[PDB]
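help with this record:
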Amino acid sequence: KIKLLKAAFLQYCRKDLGHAQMVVDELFSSHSDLDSDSELDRAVTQISVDLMDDYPASIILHQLEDKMKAHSFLMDFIHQVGLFGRLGSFPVRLLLCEHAEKLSAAIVLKNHHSRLSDLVNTAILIALNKREYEIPSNLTPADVFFREVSQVDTICECLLEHEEQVLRDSIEWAEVVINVNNILKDMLQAASHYRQNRRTVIIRQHEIVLKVAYPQADSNLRNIVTEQLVALIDCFLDGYVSQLKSVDKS
């Protein structure tokens, strides 16, 4: 229940200062716990994942860096107090920590890139999911577009298709369709190297392969190659993730 995940979230707060007291609330946990593997242990998985979702919901970059460290001393304050079980990945929702890590390095990889064309495709992507409070506070926001940034990729693609419907392709319009290719690419380069330090996502990639195919039909030589070394950089991350899921199941 909510009283429990608010008791370990209170023991992690003390797990930054000292441990002794927190190690006795994990010891009271193991004796007072259910201990029936098949779902009560996925009731404390649904707690460790509800606090990783809240350390991700948390100076907008230096503030999102402070949150990849926080979710790093939260993954170290789980390895010790242990926290050596539970896993409710199932369908759509341990791999869930790594995944929320990878998407916080994605949130810092598009925070490091802030220009007027992506900030516009982001404001179109957030006004579509819901309305924004107009008491200033207009990033228009990120702390919740992080726990769910996967969505600001399938929308900063629909804003390259409406910026391509007006592109009139004409050369400066095929330079704006590559600038986005380069960011979704090195945002997928940032999730790969965060796993080395260990059906909408995919559709938006097979959609920009085909739009990176329509453009090289009209493009100065050198440019048509750099967007080809790019769509080769991206296709090689999809085929690597279907290979890793194969090897996962047998």
User: Anything to note?
Assistant: Residues 202 and 238 are 8 Å apart (CA to CA). DSSP finds twelve helices and no strands in the chain.
